[PDB]
């Protein structure tokens, strides 16, 4: 019944992260009639504290590590939630490779580009820890491939870095940013990293912004719940 979508904080005010995340959490709301879902920025003090041991946690991360593993529980332990049910994250998610297809898809038709002449970008945060972020953005530029051209994959924190994966690529190009918040977007500058490269293509808006996502988050609720 209860379900908190929970985003990584970012620096800064935390009021407007909490806002964007409570706008989100509404969204998913109206379509998951049988739970009170609410949104949480862990930029915020106290934003765990509204969770106890029969809440679900809908985490906006990329992939599954140390934080979901340790950290959240720990986090959520103190707060009076150690039982809380962390669910898979959304960079896991079922329908997230679907939801990126149909956006470059969609990119494409308005440009008047055939999807199958046109070069894919994944850029991505990537992570200097682990290499599970990095394993799940090629999963989902290898799923993106066989419609396209081609497609790769650029991060922040790893190689190969995204001032060198958008180099040298023609102007039929898209770059997806495969961010869950427009927060952790904003930080990692994407703009100078694509100027750097002398990126010639479209760039969208991060996929955590899609008309689809609430859907998606909300089928992963109803999946949870008995
Ligand atoms: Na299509």
Not at 28 to 42: E, I, K, M, N, S
């Amino acid at each position: 019944r209860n379900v908190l979508i929970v985003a990584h904080g970012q620096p800064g005010d935390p009021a407007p992260q909490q806002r964007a995340i409570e706008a989100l959490a509404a969204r998913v709301a109206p379509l998951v009639p049988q739970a009170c879902v609410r949104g949480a920025t862990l930029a915020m003090p106290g934003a765990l504290d509204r969770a106890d041991d029969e809440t679900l946690i809908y985490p906006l991360f990329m992939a599954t590590g140390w934080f979901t593993r340790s950290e959240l529980p720990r986090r959520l332990a103190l707060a009076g939630a150690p039982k809380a049910r962390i669910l898979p994250p959304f960079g896991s998610d079922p329908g997230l490779p679907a939801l990126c297809l149909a956006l470059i898809a969609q990119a494409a038709e308005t440009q008047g580009w055939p999807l199958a002449g046109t070069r894919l970008l994944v850029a991505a945060h990537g992570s200097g820890r682990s290499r599970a972020p990095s394993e799940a953005a090629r999963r989902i530029a290898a799923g993106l491939a066989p419609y396209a051209a081609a497609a790769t994959c650029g991060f922040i924190e790893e190689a190969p870095f995204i001032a060198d994966a958008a180099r040298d690529l023609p102007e039929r190009a898209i770059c997806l940013p495969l961010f869950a918040t427009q927060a952790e977007h904003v930080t990692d500058d994407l703009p100078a990293a694509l100027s750097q490269a002398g990126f010639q293509g479209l760039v969208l808006p991060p996929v955590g912004l899609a008309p689809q996502v609430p859907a998606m988050i909300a089928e992963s609720i109803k999946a949870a719940l008995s």
